[PDB]
Amino acid sequence: KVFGRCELAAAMKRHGLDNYRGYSLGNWVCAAKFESNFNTQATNRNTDGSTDYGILQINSRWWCNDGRTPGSRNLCNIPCSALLSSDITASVNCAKKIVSDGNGMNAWVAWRNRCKGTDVQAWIRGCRL
Template structure:
C-alpha cells in the first residue's frame, strides 16, 4: 500500500512539472476573445511573435539560476511585473508570479496590457523589437481559422 502511495505521488510531481504548450492558433483565438487584436495598435501576429520568441508557447516554471526569472507565456519578470515571494519586486501587475504558470491566460493578458500602458509599448519585450517589429508576421496566422 505504501509503495502505491509513493508511485501516485511521483506521478503527480512528474505531471505537475511538465510544461503546458499552447497551440498558436488556439492562443490567437483566446487573444481575440480578450480583445488583444488591435490593442494599442498591436496585431494578433505581434502577440504570437512575442510569445514565440519569449516562451515558445510554453508555460513552465522558470529555469533561470539567477534571482530574476521570467514567468508565463509573456515572460513577466519577477523583478518588475509579479511577485514570487523571493526576489524583491515592484509587482506592477499586483499578482503572484505563480498565476502565470497555468493555461488560464486572463491574468497574463491583463498584465500584458499593463506592460504596454506603463512602459514604451511592446518595446518592453526586447524580443519583439528585435524579431517582430516591422517584419512580415503573416506566417504566425496563416493556418489559423479565426
C-alpha cells in the first residue's frame, strides 16, 4: 500500500504514535516519507547484510527476523515480512520499541538528516485529524 500523507497521519494517530516519546505526528510522517515514500512494501538492503522493512524501514539487525541476518536479534518478536502489511499496526508497535531504546528518533538516520529540527508540522498541514 502507498499511503497518502494525511491517510498515514490518521493511521499513525489511531495507533497512538502522535506525541509518542514526545515526537509530534509530523516527525513520524516526515520519517515515513524519507524512509519509504509512504510505501508499506519498501525493502532496502544495508551494506552489513541486514534489511530495512516497511513504512519506517525497521532493520533486521535488531528488531525483526528475516532468517538471513547472521548474529542479529528480533527484539520486536515478529517476522520482518509482518512489517510490509497494508495494516501498519506491527510497524507502529515495533517503532514504539525502537524510539524507546534511548536515542529517540535518531535511530532513523533519515529522520536525523532530513526531518530533525525542520518544520515537521508541514507534514500534517491540512489533514483532518
